[PDB]
Amino acid sequence: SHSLRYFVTAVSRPGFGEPRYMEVGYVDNTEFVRFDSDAENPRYEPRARWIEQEGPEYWERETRRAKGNEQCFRVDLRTALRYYNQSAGGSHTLQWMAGCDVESDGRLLRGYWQFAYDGCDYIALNEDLKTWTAADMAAQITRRKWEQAGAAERDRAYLEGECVEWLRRYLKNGNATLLRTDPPKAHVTHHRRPEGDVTLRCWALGFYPADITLTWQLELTQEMELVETRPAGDGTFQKWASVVQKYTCHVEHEGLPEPLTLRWG
């Protein structure tokens, strides 16, 4: 139920020489080691307070990693435009994601290593972890060539080895984190919309982690109405679900053996 993910992005700035290259790292959906090219004296900078405890070797070695992955994409965008006759004045983006998802029990759950171009998927690593799957004609050749090169074994080495050991390093080293433990104070509100278009709204606020399940019943299916999980400014998260006379809001969260039971109080 935990994951470490590296997000890399290259953007084509027309009329401006340096294409915008950015990288952000995450444990679960928590951001850390954000990296930018348009910052004063650019290097890897730590956003989180707990990551600041790492050594300088992390910053020099890793910043060399960023340089390699940056000049690489610099050379790669001209390859994209050389395969695709497109107006150079247009702004294009190519994104590269590489992460590993491990369960709390230590067993590796799944690993992802994918690449997309201009919002359209390009090439991805299959669930088999030994075969690639390409999304367009251009990525077909990249997939075959990468097959003959056997990139899947080295990438599998990184995703099964180094990345898992690092993930355990971030979740194990900084143990003070993840202590908000999702303690939502969920209560239901009600108004009367004209012509009886009203809805009952269960509200769960201020929790953390973000994984949570809102439900409603006596409403169990095709009923309710909800929004996407939204982060609050406090570093917490919030959510609400509305239903169109015994109705109950049950919530699955992190807590003592107790979901939730709520009517109009």
């Binding site: 952000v24 930018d36 919002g119």
Partner: protein, 98 residues
Amino acid sequence: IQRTPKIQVYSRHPAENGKSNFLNCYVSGFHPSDIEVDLLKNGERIEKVEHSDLSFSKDWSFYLLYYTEFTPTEKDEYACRVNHVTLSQPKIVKWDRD
């Protein structure tokens, strides 16, 4: 493929006009990245907010969050204006203090 943004405007606290809180316009799931977001009070743009650095989701669709620390009242309406490149007209949303 270009993805129209998902806009949710809301506050950190339930809105009862009495003391100070903080409000946030949360935009997620959009592509490309050329996104221009403004916080509007009573029709006029709020001057200086905090434009957070860009963040990427697992779905290639980025997400940004703008916010301010202020005290809400009962005689003012607030809104969020966004003009991505996917929509031809700048969209504006009202914060429902209910």
